[PDB]
Amino acid sequence: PISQYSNRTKVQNDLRSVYKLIRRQHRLSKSSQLQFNALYKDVIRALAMKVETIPFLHLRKKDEFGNWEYSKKLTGIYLDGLEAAARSGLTFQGKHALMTGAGAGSIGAEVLQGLLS
Amino acid sequence: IEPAFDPLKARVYDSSWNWARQDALSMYYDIIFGRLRVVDREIVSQCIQIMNRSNPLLLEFMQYHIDHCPTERGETYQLAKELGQQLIENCKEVLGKPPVYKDVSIPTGPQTTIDARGNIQYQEVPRASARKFEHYVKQMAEGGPISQYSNRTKVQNDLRSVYKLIRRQHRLSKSSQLQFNALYKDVIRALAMNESQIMETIPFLHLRKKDEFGNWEYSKKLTGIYLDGLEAAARSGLTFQGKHALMTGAGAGSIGAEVLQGLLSGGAKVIVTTSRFSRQVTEYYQGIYARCGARGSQLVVVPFNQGSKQDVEALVNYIYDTKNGLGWDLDYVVPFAAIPENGREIDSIDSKSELAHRIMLTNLLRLLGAIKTQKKERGYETRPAQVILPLSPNHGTFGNDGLYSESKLALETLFNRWYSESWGNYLTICGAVIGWTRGTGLMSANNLVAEGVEKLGVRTFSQQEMAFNLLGLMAPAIVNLCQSDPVFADLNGGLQFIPDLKGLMTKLRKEIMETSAIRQAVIKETAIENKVVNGEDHEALYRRVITEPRANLK
Amino acid sequence: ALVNYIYDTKNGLGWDLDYVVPFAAIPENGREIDSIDSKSELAHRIMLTNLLRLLGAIKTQKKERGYETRPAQVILPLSPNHGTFGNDGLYSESKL
Amino acid sequence: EMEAYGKFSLEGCVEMAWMMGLIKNHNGPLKGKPYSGWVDAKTGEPVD
Amino acid sequence: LKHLGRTKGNAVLGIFQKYLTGHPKGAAGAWMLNGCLQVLNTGIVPGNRNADNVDKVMEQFDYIVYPSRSIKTDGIKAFSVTSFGFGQKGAQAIGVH
Amino acid sequence: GSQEQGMGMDLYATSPVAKEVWDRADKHFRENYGFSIIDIVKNNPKELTVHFGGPRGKIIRQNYMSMTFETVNADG
């Protein structure tokens, strides 16, 4: 429930009933109803004119303006192997790894045993 | 890391009065000889300073030299007596009234030129479309095409005023209004969480505010307040009277140096730290104070080494010691201490880098930390110190930073610490991401290409400009914003919109060096060709004989 | 030195690294910018400056030994909390 | 020169350099070929 | 200057040649007199570079002003080279263009 | 007229009672008028200045502003 966002679809279907309701109420001066309509059009342009959530474990990618936004494309690939891992298992055969901070009873300690298996 | 601070070396400059009469009597003869024409913005600058130190005794000394001025000699003697009496009157209406930093220079830009004979030169030409700094502020605040309101930034500021409209026009049932911001919040969240499914300008100088998801998005509300005082600064001028400030990194010919003179023109008392404490540097600063020292102001130069933990914690106590110290309390802290680590990748973080990173981060934090506890102990509660954090736009977008970016980025953790830790009251944070600033007599590498990059519809700044910009966040307006909430200040020339800037410049870097090389190479070639064809004797006997100077003792 | 034990053909254990998992860490719990003690500076050198130097060493090793077509994956332990919590004491600053 | 201008003119340098004994006037053969004018007091060479 | 009637506001450029040359125990004035005779014939009143930051006590002295950089003037008419010494020896000289 | 520098400060240190008095007093003065009477008493300043800084600072100048003073004109 915490990572809730709406589809493009909802965003518009919401933009509809807001306009339909604010408009078919006729309490606003023709000035306010005019530029309310003005601003509504811009919003619907830039957006080009369903509940969704965020996976607790995702990968992000970089915005043109160096920003790390959720990327379902990747989060897929990751959480997908992450599944196949829990099912058939994941191997590390032939690979070499260095590990600093692998003290007893630690995150590193566990990860270690992983690669060791 | 060897300590360098020593109270006995501390030099104090405070004789505004005497210097006034000097610059005064100095300017009088300047006019008469024609070193100054009423053209030169200079005469203006100088006049403002003379007003900044208005004494009753100054006026007497002013008038006498003007009254008994012999006008029956030249137009200049007259031109003097005129401008003089004008000034004497000016100074009269300023007596007592707080001194102001007002930048009067001609806003200037980058102009790199390649000779017909291959020589590369770079001048600074007046901007063809700006004369005063008001023209500058506006030109900035307007924006540029290249800074186009991006889809999200438009969708947002649009829904913004749709709300401000629907809201501040109460006649729709609260069933509808209550269910409008519901459908409004939805749209904001969705844009933030998955922008990819859903989906005029940006000032050149704006302030940002924090998203619910800790994000620094443009805030016209603030950018207003800042750019507004930033205007009133250029117009009527900005004062610093009665305020105290510490400044590290204010070396000669630097951003800090300029900012310094600013606070000095206000009534500001600053303490400046230098890591090359020579007579040469002693002089430079007294020179500065002779010219910028408004009444009330004070300049204290000191040897210091921000590489030293001790120095830091010692400096701080000179500043705050009631007995043997200079017993101040700090209002501004401007931590521009820096070392050029140019040239190294993670490939090799040498000694220098670690040192630099300790000067730029660890001891910076400790400097603030020391200042805090000082206030905390001395009961100095209701007077926070503003810290002009020099952040950077380029967190490893450029190569060879070598521990540079890592420092500058880390600094930004302060933005949040202000809220979490218990120094809220004593220190305020004003993150100032300084942008491209071509630097006089410094490095020409960043200047040869300065012109070409501006051509992409974006701004680079002269030192004097960027100092003005900074002093802007020093203005009373913004200060109070900080005392409640940290301030982000993109003072980058809108270069945020040029991606792969690293790459752009490296291209421009080449072309310039390349064409000049070719040009002067060809010359040498065709010069050699002539010695072959014509023979040593012919070519030799036809070269401009430049006389070598000798000395005659008349 | 570690880096060369790993890559030395003769007396070393002559490997080449595929993964690098730098979880070296010191509990700096308890301090604000109020007081960046010795411990903190040390911790910050373990967690940032020498972390970078560890990678840096590994790199040049490969670069010299012609190990081109086999990159080493570095599981950078970053953090969500850049000074949102108090008393990090030089912690966040490293992680960021 | 110093008290007023703050540094030495070329004329001043030559004067100081003369009294300090860094240059003396020479007028006769110098390594065969004749020569007149300023000479370095230390290295018997000529000086422009 | 005051008790002779010096018009108030008209200060004298003060020279201190000692910053540059130090203090030749006895041949002090000789150098200072040359300083003036040189100023007389150039109008250049040489500043005092080591005038760090003049003592607040000196402000009381309306009629004197302390130059910390050379001033080229239209010319000088008369000057006063004064000096003191051990054993209550005080001597002043006035020179005219 | 009998105000001596540091008066009753010796008693301040030796009495947990008198201590708390001066404290509740200072506590007030500092947080309301922006100074400490204890300081003023301990070391006598020839001069002292308050500062209307952040949140807690703005509220202080509020009190300095809200200081009313009465003088009537010769016409009532």
JSON list of C-alpha atoms in Angstrom, two decimals, chain B residues 248-374:
[
{"chain": "B", "resi": 248, "resn": "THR", "atom": "CA", "xyz": [39.17, 30.49, 4.05]},
{"chain": "B", "resi": 249, "resn": "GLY", "atom": "CA", "xyz": [40.44, 30.24, 0.50]},
{"chain": "B", "resi": 250, "resn": "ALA", "atom": "CA", "xyz": [40.33, 33.96, -0.26]},
{"chain": "B", "resi": 251, "resn": "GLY", "atom": "CA", "xyz": [43.64, 33.86, -2.11]},
{"chain": "B", "resi": 252, "resn": "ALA", "atom": "CA", "xyz": [44.54, 36.64, -4.53]},
{"chain": "B", "resi": 253, "resn": "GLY", "atom": "CA", "xyz": [42.65, 36.54, -7.82]},
{"chain": "B", "resi": 254, "resn": "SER", "atom": "CA", "xyz": [39.94, 34.18, -6.61]},
{"chain": "B", "resi": 255, "resn": "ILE", "atom": "CA", "xyz": [36.20, 33.89, -6.12]},
{"chain": "B", "resi": 256, "resn": "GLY", "atom": "CA", "xyz": [36.77, 34.27, -2.40]},
{"chain": "B", "resi": 257, "resn": "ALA", "atom": "CA", "xyz": [38.89, 37.36, -2.97]},
{"chain": "B", "resi": 258, "resn": "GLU", "atom": "CA", "xyz": [36.06, 39.08, -4.76]},
{"chain": "B", "resi": 259, "resn": "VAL", "atom": "CA", "xyz": [33.40, 37.99, -2.29]},
{"chain": "B", "resi": 260, "resn": "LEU", "atom": "CA", "xyz": [35.70, 39.43, 0.37]},
{"chain": "B", "resi": 261, "resn": "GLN", "atom": "CA", "xyz": [35.78, 42.94, -1.04]},
{"chain": "B", "resi": 262, "resn": "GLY", "atom": "CA", "xyz": [32.02, 42.66, -1.11]},
{"chain": "B", "resi": 263, "resn": "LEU", "atom": "CA", "xyz": [31.59, 42.19, 2.63]},
{"chain": "B", "resi": 264, "resn": "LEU", "atom": "CA", "xyz": [34.33, 44.76, 3.14]},
{"chain": "B", "resi": 265, "resn": "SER", "atom": "CA", "xyz": [32.33, 47.38, 1.24]},
{"chain": "B", "resi": 266, "resn": "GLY", "atom": "CA", "xyz": [29.45, 46.59, 3.58]},
{"chain": "B", "resi": 267, "resn": "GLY", "atom": "CA", "xyz": [30.23, 47.26, 7.23]},
{"chain": "B", "resi": 268, "resn": "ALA", "atom": "CA", "xyz": [31.61, 43.75, 7.51]},
{"chain": "B", "resi": 269, "resn": "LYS", "atom": "CA", "xyz": [34.42, 42.54, 9.73]},
{"chain": "B", "resi": 270, "resn": "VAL", "atom": "CA", "xyz": [36.05, 39.53, 8.19]},
{"chain": "B", "resi": 271, "resn": "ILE", "atom": "CA", "xyz": [38.92, 37.29, 9.21]},
{"chain": "B", "resi": 272, "resn": "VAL", "atom": "CA", "xyz": [40.88, 35.91, 6.25]},
{"chain": "B", "resi": 273, "resn": "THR", "atom": "CA", "xyz": [43.19, 32.93, 6.39]},
{"chain": "B", "resi": 274, "resn": "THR", "atom": "CA", "xyz": [46.26, 32.50, 4.19]},
{"chain": "B", "resi": 275, "resn": "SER", "atom": "CA", "xyz": [48.60, 29.56, 3.66]},
{"chain": "B", "resi": 276, "resn": "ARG", "atom": "CA", "xyz": [51.28, 31.69, 2.05]},
{"chain": "B", "resi": 277, "resn": "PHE", "atom": "CA", "xyz": [51.83, 34.31, 4.67]},
{"chain": "B", "resi": 278, "resn": "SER", "atom": "CA", "xyz": [54.38, 36.65, 3.06]},
{"chain": "B", "resi": 279, "resn": "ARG", "atom": "CA", "xyz": [54.79, 40.42, 2.95]},
{"chain": "B", "resi": 280, "resn": "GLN", "atom": "CA", "xyz": [53.57, 40.10, -0.59]},
{"chain": "B", "resi": 281, "resn": "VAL", "atom": "CA", "xyz": [50.28, 38.67, 0.63]},
{"chain": "B", "resi": 282, "resn": "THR", "atom": "CA", "xyz": [50.20, 40.92, 3.67]},
{"chain": "B", "resi": 283, "resn": "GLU", "atom": "CA", "xyz": [50.33, 43.81, 1.21]},
{"chain": "B", "resi": 284, "resn": "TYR", "atom": "CA", "xyz": [47.71, 42.51, -1.22]},
{"chain": "B", "resi": 285, "resn": "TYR", "atom": "CA", "xyz": [45.10, 42.44, 1.53]},
{"chain": "B", "resi": 286, "resn": "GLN", "atom": "CA", "xyz": [45.94, 45.82, 3.01]},
{"chain": "B", "resi": 287, "resn": "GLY", "atom": "CA", "xyz": [45.75, 47.04, -0.56]},
{"chain": "B", "resi": 288, "resn": "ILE", "atom": "CA", "xyz": [42.27, 45.58, -0.74]},
{"chain": "B", "resi": 289, "resn": "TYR", "atom": "CA", "xyz": [41.25, 47.17, 2.56]},
{"chain": "B", "resi": 290, "resn": "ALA", "atom": "CA", "xyz": [42.54, 50.61, 1.60]},
{"chain": "B", "resi": 291, "resn": "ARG", "atom": "CA", "xyz": [40.09, 50.52, -1.26]},
{"chain": "B", "resi": 292, "resn": "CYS", "atom": "CA", "xyz": [37.10, 48.57, 0.08]},
{"chain": "B", "resi": 293, "resn": "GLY", "atom": "CA", "xyz": [37.14, 49.37, 3.78]},
{"chain": "B", "resi": 294, "resn": "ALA", "atom": "CA", "xyz": [33.89, 51.10, 4.59]},
{"chain": "B", "resi": 295, "resn": "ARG", "atom": "CA", "xyz": [33.62, 52.66, 8.02]},
{"chain": "B", "resi": 296, "resn": "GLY", "atom": "CA", "xyz": [32.76, 49.97, 10.54]},
{"chain": "B", "resi": 297, "resn": "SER", "atom": "CA", "xyz": [34.62, 47.33, 8.54]},
{"chain": "B", "resi": 298, "resn": "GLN", "atom": "CA", "xyz": [37.75, 45.44, 9.65]},
{"chain": "B", "resi": 299, "resn": "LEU", "atom": "CA", "xyz": [40.19, 43.08, 7.96]},
{"chain": "B", "resi": 300, "resn": "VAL", "atom": "CA", "xyz": [42.17, 40.56, 10.00]},
{"chain": "B", "resi": 301, "resn": "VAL", "atom": "CA", "xyz": [44.59, 38.39, 8.07]},
{"chain": "B", "resi": 302, "resn": "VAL", "atom": "CA", "xyz": [46.11, 35.35, 9.70]},
{"chain": "B", "resi": 303, "resn": "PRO", "atom": "CA", "xyz": [48.34, 32.43, 8.75]},
{"chain": "B", "resi": 304, "resn": "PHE", "atom": "CA", "xyz": [46.35, 29.18, 8.65]},
{"chain": "B", "resi": 305, "resn": "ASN", "atom": "CA", "xyz": [46.48, 25.69, 7.20]},
{"chain": "B", "resi": 306, "resn": "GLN", "atom": "CA", "xyz": [43.17, 23.88, 6.89]},
{"chain": "B", "resi": 307, "resn": "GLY", "atom": "CA", "xyz": [45.19, 20.70, 6.47]},
{"chain": "B", "resi": 308, "resn": "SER", "atom": "CA", "xyz": [45.73, 20.84, 10.21]},
{"chain": "B", "resi": 309, "resn": "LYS", "atom": "CA", "xyz": [43.26, 19.65, 12.82]},
{"chain": "B", "resi": 310, "resn": "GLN", "atom": "CA", "xyz": [44.98, 21.79, 15.42]},
{"chain": "B", "resi": 311, "resn": "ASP", "atom": "CA", "xyz": [45.06, 24.89, 13.24]},
{"chain": "B", "resi": 312, "resn": "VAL", "atom": "CA", "xyz": [41.37, 24.55, 12.73]},
{"chain": "B", "resi": 313, "resn": "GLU", "atom": "CA", "xyz": [40.49, 24.17, 16.41]},
{"chain": "B", "resi": 314, "resn": "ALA", "atom": "CA", "xyz": [43.00, 26.93, 17.19]},
{"chain": "B", "resi": 315, "resn": "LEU", "atom": "CA", "xyz": [41.85, 29.45, 14.61]},
{"chain": "B", "resi": 316, "resn": "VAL", "atom": "CA", "xyz": [38.39, 29.05, 15.99]},
{"chain": "B", "resi": 317, "resn": "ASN", "atom": "CA", "xyz": [39.55, 30.06, 19.44]},
{"chain": "B", "resi": 318, "resn": "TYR", "atom": "CA", "xyz": [41.42, 33.15, 18.28]},
{"chain": "B", "resi": 319, "resn": "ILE", "atom": "CA", "xyz": [38.13, 34.19, 16.83]},
{"chain": "B", "resi": 320, "resn": "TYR", "atom": "CA", "xyz": [36.10, 33.56, 19.95]},
{"chain": "B", "resi": 321, "resn": "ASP", "atom": "CA", "xyz": [38.54, 34.36, 22.77]},
{"chain": "B", "resi": 322, "resn": "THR", "atom": "CA", "xyz": [37.36, 37.29, 24.82]},
{"chain": "B", "resi": 323, "resn": "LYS", "atom": "CA", "xyz": [40.71, 37.96, 26.54]},
{"chain": "B", "resi": 324, "resn": "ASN", "atom": "CA", "xyz": [43.59, 37.48, 24.13]},
{"chain": "B", "resi": 325, "resn": "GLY", "atom": "CA", "xyz": [41.55, 36.61, 21.07]},
{"chain": "B", "resi": 326, "resn": "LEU", "atom": "CA", "xyz": [39.68, 39.04, 18.85]},
{"chain": "B", "resi": 327, "resn": "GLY", "atom": "CA", "xyz": [36.48, 38.07, 20.65]},
{"chain": "B", "resi": 328, "resn": "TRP", "atom": "CA", "xyz": [34.00, 37.94, 17.78]},
{"chain": "B", "resi": 329, "resn": "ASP", "atom": "CA", "xyz": [31.03, 35.79, 16.99]},
{"chain": "B", "resi": 330, "resn": "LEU", "atom": "CA", "xyz": [30.63, 34.57, 13.41]},
{"chain": "B", "resi": 331, "resn": "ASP", "atom": "CA", "xyz": [27.74, 35.50, 11.09]},
{"chain": "B", "resi": 332, "resn": "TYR", "atom": "CA", "xyz": [29.09, 34.11, 7.85]},
{"chain": "B", "resi": 333, "resn": "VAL", "atom": "CA", "xyz": [31.49, 31.27, 7.16]},
{"chain": "B", "resi": 334, "resn": "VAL", "atom": "CA", "xyz": [32.84, 30.94, 3.65]},
{"chain": "B", "resi": 335, "resn": "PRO", "atom": "CA", "xyz": [34.90, 27.71, 3.41]},
{"chain": "B", "resi": 336, "resn": "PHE", "atom": "CA", "xyz": [36.65, 27.97, 0.02]},
{"chain": "B", "resi": 337, "resn": "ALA", "atom": "CA", "xyz": [39.84, 26.24, 1.12]},
{"chain": "B", "resi": 338, "resn": "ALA", "atom": "CA", "xyz": [41.01, 24.17, -1.83]},
{"chain": "B", "resi": 339, "resn": "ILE", "atom": "CA", "xyz": [43.83, 22.23, -3.48]},
{"chain": "B", "resi": 340, "resn": "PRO", "atom": "CA", "xyz": [44.19, 21.53, -7.22]},
{"chain": "B", "resi": 341, "resn": "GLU", "atom": "CA", "xyz": [44.19, 17.73, -7.46]},
{"chain": "B", "resi": 342, "resn": "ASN", "atom": "CA", "xyz": [43.94, 17.91, -11.23]},
{"chain": "B", "resi": 343, "resn": "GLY", "atom": "CA", "xyz": [45.28, 14.88, -13.10]},
{"chain": "B", "resi": 344, "resn": "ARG", "atom": "CA", "xyz": [44.38, 11.66, -11.31]},
{"chain": "B", "resi": 345, "resn": "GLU", "atom": "CA", "xyz": [41.77, 8.91, -11.59]},
{"chain": "B", "resi": 346, "resn": "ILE", "atom": "CA", "xyz": [40.92, 6.33, -8.92]},
{"chain": "B", "resi": 347, "resn": "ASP", "atom": "CA", "xyz": [43.82, 4.76, -10.76]},
{"chain": "B", "resi": 348, "resn": "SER", "atom": "CA", "xyz": [45.99, 6.56, -8.19]},
{"chain": "B", "resi": 349, "resn": "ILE", "atom": "CA", "xyz": [44.76, 8.49, -5.16]},
{"chain": "B", "resi": 350, "resn": "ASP", "atom": "CA", "xyz": [48.13, 9.94, -4.19]},
{"chain": "B", "resi": 351, "resn": "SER", "atom": "CA", "xyz": [49.24, 11.80, -1.05]},
{"chain": "B", "resi": 352, "resn": "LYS", "atom": "CA", "xyz": [48.12, 15.14, -2.43]},
{"chain": "B", "resi": 353, "resn": "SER", "atom": "CA", "xyz": [44.58, 13.80, -2.96]},
{"chain": "B", "resi": 354, "resn": "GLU", "atom": "CA", "xyz": [44.17, 12.47, 0.54]},
{"chain": "B", "resi": 355, "resn": "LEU", "atom": "CA", "xyz": [45.51, 15.79, 1.83]},
{"chain": "B", "resi": 356, "resn": "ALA", "atom": "CA", "xyz": [43.17, 17.73, -0.39]},
{"chain": "B", "resi": 357, "resn": "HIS", "atom": "CA", "xyz": [40.21, 15.61, 0.65]},
{"chain": "B", "resi": 358, "resn": "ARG", "atom": "CA", "xyz": [41.06, 16.32, 4.29]},
{"chain": "B", "resi": 359, "resn": "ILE", "atom": "CA", "xyz": [41.24, 20.06, 3.65]},
{"chain": "B", "resi": 360, "resn": "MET", "atom": "CA", "xyz": [38.04, 20.08, 1.59]},
{"chain": "B", "resi": 361, "resn": "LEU", "atom": "CA", "xyz": [35.88, 17.70, 3.67]},
{"chain": "B", "resi": 362, "resn": "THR", "atom": "CA", "xyz": [37.05, 16.38, 7.05]},
{"chain": "B", "resi": 363, "resn": "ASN", "atom": "CA", "xyz": [38.49, 19.64, 8.35]},
{"chain": "B", "resi": 364, "resn": "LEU", "atom": "CA", "xyz": [35.75, 21.68, 6.76]},
{"chain": "B", "resi": 365, "resn": "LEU", "atom": "CA", "xyz": [33.28, 19.76, 8.89]},
{"chain": "B", "resi": 366, "resn": "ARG", "atom": "CA", "xyz": [35.54, 20.20, 11.87]},
{"chain": "B", "resi": 367, "resn": "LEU", "atom": "CA", "xyz": [35.76, 23.93, 11.27]},
{"chain": "B", "resi": 368, "resn": "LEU", "atom": "CA", "xyz": [31.97, 24.22, 11.42]},
{"chain": "B", "resi": 369, "resn": "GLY", "atom": "CA", "xyz": [31.94, 21.78, 14.32]},
{"chain": "B", "resi": 370, "resn": "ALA", "atom": "CA", "xyz": [34.33, 23.98, 16.27]},
{"chain": "B", "resi": 371, "resn": "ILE", "atom": "CA", "xyz": [32.41, 27.16, 15.55]},
{"chain": "B", "resi": 372, "resn": "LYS", "atom": "CA", "xyz": [29.26, 25.50, 16.80]},
{"chain": "B", "resi": 373, "resn": "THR", "atom": "CA", "xyz": [30.49, 24.29, 20.16]},
{"chain": "B", "resi": 374, "resn": "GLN", "atom": "CA", "xyz": [32.03, 27.68, 20.71]}
]
